[PDB]
């Protein structure tokens, strides 16, 4: 049984587990759904049972977790503005690091980016921000 | 003499879609209907408080009830006469349309052919039949048999065509080209298209978290008309 106040730890990292999966969705997602919150518990006491530890560690958590995590690895395979350029950079890097080097012409990125985002495009001003957003971003990342 | 009302689906967007494409995979329908009317019920600000304090009342005294009746009275027509007026003017007179008045209406109608073919040049995405402009004809000789004349005139087309026009304004209004492709599917997986069916598209776009109903159908007739 863990009354220990360490568990509070696991909380972050519930929260560490989630965040950087949230983006791309079309990462190992899962969600990551709440039962894996649940999860982690019985995994926590499963590692308690194994090793006589009672109120365990922080540390064997942290092995349930890693656990989990690998676990999902091999499922993998205001600037909300400058968030969704990011995630273009992100996406395209993941995409093509695993189907290839990534590199090629910096323009092209931006080229099949507007080709993607023009189906949310509500008005021609989110087109021009988008345009002017990804174009700051590259002129900020070089 | 048919008088339809179709439910339209998913709502405002199917305006954002093209305005046909509504009914099943056919617009044909609509090609036999005369007069298509989408439609909206923007309350002018003293309709949905017309409809809403009638709610919040609807008990006593009655007062709205009667005051229904002498709308009944003074509503014009007592409409059990104007029953009786229909069936009159149905069977005593029938109207015929003045020449003036007919290549007024050719005029109308390679217009309308003309400038909406420029429209669609473009491929502008919606039509015109002949059966449309012999629709405008039985509005204008039914308005003509309102005022129950042996025949018509101009002015009493010129509503006529606008009215129509109206109509006309109406027969106007996952990415689609991403799941528009299925084209990488029907290449390099599938010249045969067999064991890939509808079925094979949705094990395919079934956890790529990808595709709806109506979208795979959308994406499907797009590129069968498209030529794809």
């Given amino acids: 049984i863990l009354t220990k106040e360490a568990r509070s730890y696991l909380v972050e990292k519930y929260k560490e587990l989630r965040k950087d999966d949230a983006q791309g969705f079309s990462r190992s997602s899962y969600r990551i759904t709440v039962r894996q919150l649940e999860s982690m518990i019985r995994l926590s006491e499963a590692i308690a049972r194994a090793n006589c530890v009672d109120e365990i560690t922080p540390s064997f958590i942290a092995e349930a977790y890693d656990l989990l995590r690998q676990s999902i690895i091999r499922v993998d395979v205001t600037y909300d503005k400058y968030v969704s350029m990011m995630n273009m950079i992100v996406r395209k890097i993941a995409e093509v690091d695993r189907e290839g080097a990534e590199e090629l012409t910096a323009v092209d990125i931006v080229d099949w980016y507007l080709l993607q985002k023009e189906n949310d495009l509500g008005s021609l001003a989110e087109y021009w921000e988008e345009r002017r957003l990804a174009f700051k971003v590259i002129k900020r990342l070089v | ?228």
């Fill in chain 2, 1 to 228: 003499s048919v008088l339809a009302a179709a439910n339209p689906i998913y709502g405002r967007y199917d305006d954002l879609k093209s305005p046909g494409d509504n009914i099943d995979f056919q617009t044909t329908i609509l090609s036999r209907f005369d007069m298509i009317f989408i439609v909206k019920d923007d309350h002018n600000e003293e309709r949905d408080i017309s409809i809403a304090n009638h709610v919040i009342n609807i008990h006593t005294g009655n007062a709205n009830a009667m005051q229904n009746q002498q709308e009944e009275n003074g509503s014009e027509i007592s409409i059990e006469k104007m029953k009786r007026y229909i069936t009159y003017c149905r069977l005593k007179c029938a109207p015929r349309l003045s020449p003036q008045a007919a290549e007024k209406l050719s005029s109308n109608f390679v217009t309308i052919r003309k400038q909406l073919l420029i429209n669609e040049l473009e491929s502008t995405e919606r039509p015109i039949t002949i059966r449309q402009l012999e629709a405008i004809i039985r509005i204008t000789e039914s308005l003509a048999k309102l005022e129950l004349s042996p025949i018509a005139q101009e002015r009493h087309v010129d509503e006529a065509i606008r009215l129509f026009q109206a109509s006309t304004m109406d027969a106007a209004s996952t990415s689609l080209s991403e799941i528009r492709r299925f084209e990488q599917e029907l290449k390099r997986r599938l010249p045969i298209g067999w064991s890939t069916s509808y079925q094979t598209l949705r094990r395919e776009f079934v956890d790529t978290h990808r595709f709806s109903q109506l979208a795979l159908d959308k994406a499907l007739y797009a590129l069968e008309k498209h030529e794809t």
